[PDB]
Amino acid sequence: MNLFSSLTLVTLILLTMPIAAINFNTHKFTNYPLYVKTTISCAFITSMIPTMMFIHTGQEMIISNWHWLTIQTLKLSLSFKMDFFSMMFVPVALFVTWSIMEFSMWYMHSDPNINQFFKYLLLFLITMLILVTANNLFQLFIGWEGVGIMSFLLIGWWYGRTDANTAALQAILYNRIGDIGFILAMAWFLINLNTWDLQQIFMLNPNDSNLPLMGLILAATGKSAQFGLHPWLPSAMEGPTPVSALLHSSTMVVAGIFLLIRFYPLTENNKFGQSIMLCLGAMTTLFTAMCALTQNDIKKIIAFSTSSQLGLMMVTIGINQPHLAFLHICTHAFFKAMLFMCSGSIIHSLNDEQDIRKMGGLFKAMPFTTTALIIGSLALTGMPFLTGFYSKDLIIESANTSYTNAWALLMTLVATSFTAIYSTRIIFFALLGQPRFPTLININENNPFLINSIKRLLIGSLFAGFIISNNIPPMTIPQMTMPHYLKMTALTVTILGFILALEISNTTHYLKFNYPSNTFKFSNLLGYYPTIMHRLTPYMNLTMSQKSASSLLDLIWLETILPKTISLAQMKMSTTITSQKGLIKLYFLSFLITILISTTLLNFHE
Template identity: 30%
Template sequence: MNQLLVLFIAIPFLAFLVSLFWQNKSERAIASIVRFTKVLYIIVSLSFAVWWIWNGLQPVSYHLATLYQTDHFVFAFELFYDEVTAVFSIVGALLFFLVATFSKYYMHRDEGYKRFFNTILLFAAGYNFIILSGNFETLFIGWEIKGVCSFLLIAFYRNRYLPVKNAFKAISYYRISDVSLMLCMWMMHHLTHQNITFDKLGEAKNMAIQSGHAGMAVFIVCMMILPAAIKSAQFPFTAWLPRAMEGPTASSAIFYGSLSVHIGVFLLLRTHPFWEDMLWAKIVIIIIGATTAIVATFIARVQPTVKTQIAYSSAAQIGLMFIEVAIGWHWLVLVHFAGNAFLRTYQLLVSPSVLNYLVHHQYFHYTPPEQKPISKIKASLYMLGIKEWNLDSIMFTYLWSPFKWLGKQLQFLQSSIFIGILAFTGLALLTIGYTYQNSIPSSGGALPLIVMGIALAVILFAFSYRQSALKAWAYLLIAHMFIIAAVLLNTTHINSIEIIFYVSGILPAFLLGYYCLQKIKAIDNDISLNQYHGYVYEQETTGLLFLFAVIGMLGFPVTAAFIGIDVLFTYIESSQGALIILMGLCLLFIELSAFRILLRIFMGPHKKLNHPVAFRSS
């Protein structure tokens, strides 16, 4: 029966592949595939839960595959099933069926009908990867899939300004959580020197205590709490949640009302054995949850739009779940999760009907509100709530603006001469690092720091550059060269296959992206990043290919670069804090720079006005 865990992932993923062969106008066929998939998913979820209960509620684990293994590194897929997985899978199966059935009619004759259901099915596979994960590597695959699906559904109305802008905001926060989770995996590897499974996290905690590595344990816990807080829209990262509801109401219900937004709670539940004895971690989680519950409640009570009210109300409830997890009331958390997920899904799905009823109702039963004096405190809280406590502007000012300012100071790099110099230098460092790695002193030298610093500088320039998209794209490849060179210069030995893993994903993605940008440039010779071009309107296939290039450039799980990036992390020692911070920032801003190019060139309002174009405020 353990092997049947694979069905949870295989069913939605195979349905996703099958749905790709149908055209957008084949609504009945697509809906039938989705309905059959969701019914089968419900049957599998309930049947496995019954079998698990019948066998005494014992946790079930299954080793799916080992993709790569060396003396110092193992990349394996592990599946795990317990009471947390059972609740999340059953709730997920029921909500997927509910939303899919609703969407069959809600999305009728929409030009993105097929695209919507393709993304929903892929998200279902990613969601199951997360809830069934038995180790961090498996969880991270689902984490990445879910992030990209979220981005695609926020930007579902891709020829409008606000959905595209808010999709970039959401993916910016998501990438911070991605890098944080990668750093957690990196430090866990150095602590345990093995591919640790979730059922052995208690042993890893004892290992940290007995070996005197309390600092490593503190770092790991911080890198667990941060992505959990971001994914669940906890303070101070709450502002992205209502902005993520720019997509269709059905996707808002399944993503940001019910399942996706609770993944942070799942992460805390799954990693609880590691930090359950750390009082400071519990206090931090309780403070985050309590602050979010209070602030989000104040905001939700005064917001004028229904989606914003529901978003902040959901964040407030998740804040209470954080408190419950920290206290140890895990069954209460699971009940709370199920109740909140079903309630928010219901509220979002009926919100258009409710608004229509209220608009109709006020014509016949409208009574003007009474003018009542309010205290200064209430007025202040009201204004703070209306402005969402300025959370969005604070994050932009203090988190992103400093990096954009640094990138603007590097505008001298836009010269073609500097591109040639940097490309030649990167190749030279790669050659030296690979050829003479046995004779170069490793660990702690200044040279890897300098090279990684150059990589970050190049990426920040591409992140803030507003001229040619081709130049920005080329600089991302150059940055990858410097990243590999820095890791080569930091170690005395690295397997050639590991470099091949990395390059085999990055180089084809770069060439594909370069081809797409050249094709767009041939249309009107303008691919600047000063504005949105919206070329997906007339070049949909090219836009899809460039999306593949972007996710390949980032080391998405569809390429071998995903393994390569994970392996390269292990060659940075736990004592090299500065180097790992630089590499983390590089991976963070590479994704943001690549997605920025995608959004500016292919999405947003179409620059040609020979057809109707939506207003920026729509």
């Protein structure tokens, strides 16, 4: 088909021309942000069309060309496809990133290194798009490590600031543990099914699916900021703000679980696999939910919130419902891109003090961003018919109506209450209280690009959740037959969480000054996991690197065993042989005893 394939390929190919613009530049532009924004707008307006054709007819397809190293029984080309997920995801990402181009025209206007910034961020979009279009698994690996290293650079944008390059080093380290998991899965697929190709792998159903799915779990919990490898996410928040928006709202964080959403016909079986899936999801959900409480920075609250949402998506893969998880990806992406962009607006408006202490009075300080925050932190919980209703509450309904682990259900329930209460506390300390922020104020939103971007994403997070979530072919069986107190329980838990957080707020209105009781510490110090592991394992490995590797094994022992013993043997034998004083009687006595020892002891005439 001409139109469908041609328009998908031009949506891929429009994100190569501004790299040609900077490479063949030679006379430096000024409207290069305008150029990147309008080419992302054109890429979205050509990415709307084949999705419309997809819902209107069906008609999935793959394209595959330019094979290189067709060596053995396998062959690999640039091979990418558009199916349900693979082109229902792309317009959402392009739309979100076009709004971030608006907000990054505004927010990064006063820094003269803007061209290299938009170069890096466009290249990041290119790599994540290559990740979400491909079916050749090696091309998925290309997109994987490419978005890992662009995440490294965009976290370490502000050179100087040892926190930033420490953050970037932690991010690339956990991405290489994602790499060891993913290459273990790739090795099993090569050796047991002759390829890494999703068509043939789904064509079979290999039943001994333990080693590859364990590798997939390791790769997903590395890339998707989950328990065991989670604490790089607030550290990743320590970079620039639209960096953090694009990097942990829509892209680069769903690419852990998007692989598992891709491999649904292989994880149809293996009850052990789904048990690991939803146990890990419930652990992450409760852990970063409890850790999100008593956090006093904005971006770290938003990072723990998005980690809890990815925990619900791992629960959504544990129950056999992948399409609901994909719907949650889309709505979540719109939602937290809008939330990050609103918080970045406030932080640049208030001289970057950035913290929840010394933040208070912002309602009626022009209330466009307060409207954005109340729509957002309303939409994070289950609000009965908004965008956050559909995904999250179908997730908890299908999680409750299944043969589940009976404790993961309780973990997701308690953590839904926890996301209700930190949503309430971020509203209360950000917008409501008495104004605590220093004088000579220049709070400003008389500004075209800011209100256009926030406008576009609130129009997104009000309608596009329903528009996406309704006209899709039903790829599963909806449950739809619940008792009482199993459908009501989402709204019940969010309302009791609001009552709990509002009474905690009214106790904050009091004055008693209670001492902490170390659960405050356990929830306040990011959990003890970052401090304990980041002071043990950099100390243990490098203590065993100085003693064993550096001074002990190579240098001192290997230079004693191979050079020194040989050289000292030659030195001592030389100082025994050549140390002869010149008396002739000794030499002729040596001749005589040589003659006797050759005749009678060790015979030479016999």
